[PDB]
Design a protein around this ligand. Structure first.
Ligand SMILES: CC(=O)N[C@H]1[C@@H](O[C@H]2[C@@H](O)[C@@H](CO)O[C@H](O)[C@@H]2O[C@@H]2O[C@@H](C)[C@@H](O)[C@@H](O)[C@@H]2O)O[C@H](CO)[C@H](O)[C@@H]1O
Ligand SMILES: CC(=O)N[C@H]1[C@@H](O[C@H]2[C@@H](O)[C@@H](CO)O[C@H](O)[C@@H]2O[C@@H]2O[C@@H](C)[C@@H](O)[C@@H](O)[C@@H]2O)O[C@H](CO)[C@H](O)[C@@H]1O
Lengths: 307, 307
């Protein structure tokens, strides 16, 4: 079998696979109070994309299409198009368009538009509430709240570029976004389909290891923590390499090339997530040049040295 | 020598190295009316980053620091920090902080901020004019025009996330941005330093081959074309692989795995740019699964089959 590898990029050189921001740190914690089932940043070690995962680090939480104004408001409905501006196909066997947000929250950014005829352009602050009834990306429609009642034109290509998240400051602080709560991609009382599975540690004394970023906050008191299971660069790497998994777990060592010593070891499960031997919440302290290295194929219940 | 390779990702699976948006197409044209000296997306084939190039696809045209309000306006001065929020060091031998915009234009996005004490947040539309006298990123300072006169706090971490570009619609359409005009990183009448060199075809009948995207337009009639010399994924790949160049030019073939036939060939110069045998402006038509493949090391003046 073709030898398996992970990139040698450091954590801070890599990108969150769930929102277009750099990775900041590694974090581990118990995950019993939630279901860890993100749909972006999902890929097997042999390169099979899962859920709503696609390859672009900058086509995550974006939308494209044309918009229609909702009378008596600053709200616009976007009829979704594909990345190359073609009609959206709701019958593809995916949960929602690839790159669709995979958490319930209020994502703020800019809605921009070009008029084809003369190249005139416009841009307005906009928010999408992924927990709202009109959030139906699998059906081909989402709604944005904006700062205009009349500037956007119909039947002109329109893009949403995400920036960060908001919260209602008159309610309990940090109560949203909820990063581990999937939206209902087809709206209220319709089940999600074609999902990447939930993940959890399976061996005693282990926890998931998360690749963590802090989303920009744009209003209120949001929970800005965002954990992904794989860096976007790992998704791109496995997709290209397509090296076969020789067991259920790739043992990785995290090495400091400065001192030449292994800092810790972890399990990269072939379905695309990482666990470590630790109990409790912990922000890992790592050197800037630290990187992960594949060392060997082991079994699911291999006993790791404590992190 | 370690074998040289380029990624097998397709054009549409890759990212512009000069602005955080996907690649759309390949473009070639004559470049005599301009100096092609971009500072982002610059890397040798053996993995040496040049100019202001860094590794993150989502740390391009971003800024971070703290802000001070300019009385009697909606303008804020940002005192720049590093990616990990440390003091900026102007003595590093680079043209400007890595990821600094490398063109003269008006870049619009959102300026966001978190108050450390309570986690309160705020976000406002903001524009940076990279041709303006206060655009002095190499000195550690840039100015933003915003939509607020009082909401941003002092001595709190503040981020700018870029979205697109604007133009003054009362002046000649598409006269800005000017993608091939470098800002003056230390301001008026101070020479830029430590630049990646300008590039140009050197063999008769050749033109640069550009990796092209369309920036979102946020107001007016901007020129939204943006050409990079290398995809960001190629920068990341060469940085990791560090395969030695065995001649001045890596001959690449662009292959359609569908039909099994080579579509065209091109030269990847070891200093990190591509040329093709063509005269005239041309949007290349390529199949979605088309990709580049390294075939052999050749000399600078190797004669390519016409594109
Ligand atoms: C759209 C607008 O006019 N924004 C103002 C407004 O912003 C408020 C407002 O949107 C309320 C709505 O419930 O939500 C927040 O209170 C928001 O303020 C934002 O969040 C608070 C916690 C602070 O961090 C604040 O600085 C931030 O802007 O009023 C505020 C001033 O209170 C600003 O004037 C916005 O521009
Ligand atoms: C900030 C604001 O109030 N924006 C309005 C305004 O926007 C104008 C204005 O900013 C002028 C300043 O010289 O620049 C443009 O004209 C801009 O309009 C934008 O560009 C034109 C070419 C159109 O594409 C327009 O749709 C776009 O918004 O007025 C416009 C209406 O003319 C909107 O009301 C903005 O919200």
């Amino acid at each position: 079998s073709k030898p398996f590898t992970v990139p040698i990029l450091t954590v801070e050189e890599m990108t969150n696979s769930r929102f277009p921001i750099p990775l900041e740190k590694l974090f581990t914690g118990p995950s019993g109070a939630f279901v860890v089932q993100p749909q972006n940043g999902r890929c097997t070690t042999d390169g099979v994309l899962l859920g709503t995962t696609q390859l672009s680090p900058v086509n995550i939480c974006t939308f494209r299409g044309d918009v229609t104004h909702i009378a008596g408001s600053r709200n616009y409905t976007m009829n979704l198009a594909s990345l190359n501006w073609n009609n959206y196909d709701p019958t593809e066997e995916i949960p929602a368009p690839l790159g669709t947000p995979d958490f319930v929250g209020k994502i703020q950014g800019l809605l921009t538009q070009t008029t084809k005829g003369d190249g005139s352009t416009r841009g307005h602050k906009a928010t999408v509430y992924t927990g709202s009834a009109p959030f139906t990306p699998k059906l081909g429609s989402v709604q944005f709240s904006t700062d205009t009642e009349n500037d956007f034109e119909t039947h002109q290509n329109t893009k949403f570029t995400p920036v960060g998240v908001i919260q209602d400051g008159s309610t309990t602080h940090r109560n949203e976004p909820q990063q581990w709560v999937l939206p209902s991609y087809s709206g209220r009382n319709v089940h999600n389909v074609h999902l990447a599975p939930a993940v959890a540690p399976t061996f005693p004394g282990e926890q998931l290891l998360f690749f963590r970023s802090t989303m920009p906050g744009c209003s209120g008191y949001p929970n800005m923590d965002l954990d992904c299971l794989l860096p976007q660069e790992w998704v791109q790497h496995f997709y290209q390499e397509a090296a076969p998994a020789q067991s259920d777990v790739a043992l990785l060592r995290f090495v400091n090339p400065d001192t030449g010593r292994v800092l810790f070891e972890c399990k990269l499960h072939k379905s695309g997530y990482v666990t470590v031997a630790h109990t409790g919440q912990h922000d890992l302290v790592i050197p800037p040049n630290g990187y992960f290295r594949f060392d060997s194929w082991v079994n699911q219940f291999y006993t790791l040295a404590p992190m």
